[PDB]
Amino acid sequence: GAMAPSYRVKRMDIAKNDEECVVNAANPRGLPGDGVCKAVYKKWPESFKNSATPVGTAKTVMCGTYPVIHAVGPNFSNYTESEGDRELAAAYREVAKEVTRLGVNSVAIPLLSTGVYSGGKDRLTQSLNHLFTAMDSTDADVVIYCRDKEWEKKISEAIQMRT
Numbered sequence: 001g002a003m004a005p006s007y008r009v010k011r012m013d014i015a016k017n018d019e020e021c022v023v024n025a026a027n028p029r030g031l032p033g034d035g036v037c038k039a040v041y042k043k044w045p046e047s048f049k050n051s052a053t054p055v056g057t058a059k060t061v062m063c064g065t066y067p068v069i070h071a072v073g074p075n076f077s078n079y080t081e082s083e084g085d086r087e088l089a090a091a092y093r094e095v096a097k098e099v100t101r102l103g104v105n106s107v108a109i110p111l112l113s114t115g116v117y118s119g120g121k122d123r124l125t126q127s128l129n130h131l132f133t134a135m136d137s138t139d140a141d142v143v144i145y146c147r148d149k150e151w152e153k154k155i156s157e158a159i160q161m162r163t
């Protein structure tokens with residue numbers, strides 16, 4: 001575990017993370033995809049061997065000894081708000097199980113279902129709160145990656161609000 005487990009946020013490419021493992025915002029089919037998933041495919045393509053997994057689950061594949069946790073958030077274009085919310089919470093719970101199982105002291109994590117899978121809605125708060133629900137009981141240092149300056153501010157405020 002980390003000596004004083006923390007949450008931090010960074011505005012940069014998660015493919016350049018400084019953590020002991022990465023969470024991919026994966027598609028269920030293990031395809032290279034777009035956004036976070038395409039960056040993860042370019043950086044850790046070996047981790048896409050048998051990475052396909054259902055919505056609401058996480059499947060870890062090693063790239064060398066570096067773990068890539070493929071977490072499949074719901075596409076809110078396809079799910080109802082209710083079912084999508086349930087699956088988004090579940091994906092994060094599976095990430096917490098994997099991070100725990102791997103024994104890492106740190107993890108780089110994107111906000112699941114906030115991009116192409118958001119169904120055109122702002123889901124920062126919904127996705128981050130499900131991340132917290134899942135990760136709060138873990139003792140890894142969590143580093144949340146985002147790309148938008150306004151998101152960085154909002155994520156940072158939500159972290160600081162709890163401390």
Ligand SMILES: [Cl-]
Binds near residue numbers: 013016
């Ligand atoms: Cl960058």
Ligand SMILES: [Cl-]
Binds near residue numbers: 112
């Ligand atoms: Cl997404």
Ligand SMILES: [Cl-]
Binds near residue numbers: 151
């Ligand atoms: Cl972002």
